[PDB]
Amino acid sequence: SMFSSNRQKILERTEILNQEWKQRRIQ
Amino acid sequence: KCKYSFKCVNSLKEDHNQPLFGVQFNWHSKEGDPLVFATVGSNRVTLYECHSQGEIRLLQSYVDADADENFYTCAWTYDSNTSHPLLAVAGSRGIIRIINPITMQCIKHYVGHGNAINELKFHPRDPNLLLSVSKDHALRLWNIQTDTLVAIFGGVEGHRDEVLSADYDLLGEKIMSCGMDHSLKLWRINSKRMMNAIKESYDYPFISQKIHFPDFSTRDIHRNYVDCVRWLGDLILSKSCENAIVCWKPGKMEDDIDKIKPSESNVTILGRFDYSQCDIWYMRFSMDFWQKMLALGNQVGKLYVWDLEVEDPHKAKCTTLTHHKCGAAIRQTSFSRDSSILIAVCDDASIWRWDRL
Ligand SMILES: COc1cccc(C[C@H]2C[C@H]3Cc4c(cccc4OC)C[C@@H]3N(C)C2)c1
Numbered sequence: 001s002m003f004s005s006n007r008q009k010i011l012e013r014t015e016i017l018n019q020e021w022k023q024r025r026i027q
Numbered sequence: 028k029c030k031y032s033f034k035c036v037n038s039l040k041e042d043h044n045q046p047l048f049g050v051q052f053n054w055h056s057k058e059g060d061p062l063v064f065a066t067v068g069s070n071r072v073t074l075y076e077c078h079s080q081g082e083i084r085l086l087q088s089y090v091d092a093d094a095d096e097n098f099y100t101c102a103w104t105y106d107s108n109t110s111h112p113l114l115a116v117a118g119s120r121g122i123i124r125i126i127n128p129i130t131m132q133c134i135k136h137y138v139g140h141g142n143a144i145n146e147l148k149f150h151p152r153d154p155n156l157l158l159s160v161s162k163d164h165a166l167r168l169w170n171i172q173t174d175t176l177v178a179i180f181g182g183v184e185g186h187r188d189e190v191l192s193a194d195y196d197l198l199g200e201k202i203m204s205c206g207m208d209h210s211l212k213l214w215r216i217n218s219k220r221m222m223n224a225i226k227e228s229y230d231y232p233f234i235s236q237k238i239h240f241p242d243f244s245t246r247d248i249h250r251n252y253v254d255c256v257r258w259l260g261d262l263i264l265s266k267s268c269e270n271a272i273v274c275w276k277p278g279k280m281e282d283d284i285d286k287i288k289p290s291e292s293n294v295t296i297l298g299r300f301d302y303s304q305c306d307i308w309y310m311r312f313s314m315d316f317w318q319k320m321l322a323l324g325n326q327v328g329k330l331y332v333w334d335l336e337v338e339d340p341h342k343a344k345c346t347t348l349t350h351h352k353c354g355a356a357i358r359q360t361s362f363s364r365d366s367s368i369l370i371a372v373c374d375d376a377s378i379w380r381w382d383r384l
Contacts, residue, residue, distance in 0.1 A: 002280070002297065003338045006259070006260040006261060006262055007260070007336070009197075009260040009261060010197070010259070010260040010317075010318050013197035013198055013260070014197060014316065014317055014318065016197075016198070017151055017152075017197065018316075020152070021054075021055070021057075024055075024057065024105075024110075025110055026057060026110045027110060
């Protein structure tokens with residue numbers, strides 16, 4: 001499915017971004 | 028079927044009474060930190076904090092010394108060294124200003140762009156890589172750490188009229204641009220040429236790359252100005268004058284985005300998100316961080332929201348957000364990082380806060 005596969009790519013790639021946001025050093 | 032519900036909890040109007048063209052929440056602030064958004068319009072840049080019970084707390088405002096300046100866009104980043112937030116702004120004067128939000132002062136500026144800057148975007152992985160799209164038909168990639176112009180995307184096979192919008196994909200490997208020439212163009216930044224160009228801007232007059240040829244080009248989606256473009260995974264969402272956001276992809280239904288050749292002639296229209304009374308140029312659509320929601324304001328002050336997790340773009344429709352005092356054109360909307368708040372900015376300098384239910 002075009003939808004199911006595209007949704008999984010968004011899921012994995014936003015997860016990678018979210019992890020980087022979580023890890024981010026401050027002050 | 029869509030489940031998302033919102034309640035209008037507050038509104039205000041900025042004293043300049045001029046159109047607000049841009050709104051952006053800071054998606055870099057960490058969990059628990061105050062929810063902050065910036066608005067842009069006229070010669071002003073304004074910061075607000077979102078508090079409980081729909082309270083919208085004014086933090087500070089930047090008033091440009093040039094009264095004739097009209098800001099069109101803003102984008103958030105962070106200083107990779109100090110870790111503190113930074114805000115980029117630009118418009119009609121073609122000058123990129125890097126504001127420190129703590130003091131709301133211009134700490135460095137970039138000139139060069141032949142004219143007005145229509146949109147700014149920060150790279151999703153590198154906080155130093157700023158993309159600007161201009162009235163001069165070109166896109167420019169900047170490194171705000173070394174103050175270098177990494178690349179100019181335009182020329183021989185570049186845009187033929189104003190570049191109106193552009194978006195990096197999720198991993199920051201490629202940009203999709205759009206404008207007044209009706210075309211959407213692909214620019215790969217994960218090429219050996221570009222990766223080395225970026226690496227060289229960090230080693231640093233610097234010699235900018237001139238990217239005359241895009242990696243894909245189509246004029247088969249819209250029949251008027253393309254004012255907004257955003258990636259949806261490997262697919263693209265774009266809009267024009269025509270009351271629809273079109274979901275499409277370069278090549279054939281089964282073709283891979285990374286297997287597309289620069290001469291590819293096919294496009295596949297996967298779907299259309301239909302709405303009404305948004306037949307005026309210069310109206311942005313937005314998505315939330317997880318790309319589960321899609322929002323667009325119309326010219327009579329109605330706010331459309333769709334559920335991107337429902338396959339058919341007819342059943343995807345949420346209930347339209349409306350308020351009898353909100354009748355002016357909604358130029359742009361912004362979701363807070365956690366999708367709990369939706370801000371809409373208008374042609375009459377009004378701001379509207381909608382909290383999720
Ligand atoms: C908010 O969505 C946008 C989508 C794409 C690009 C932009 C920046 C644009 C702002 C435009 C505003 C405008 C123009 C002419 C007459 C009245 C006007 O204001 C009601 C020309 C400007 N344009 C060429 C650049 C905004």
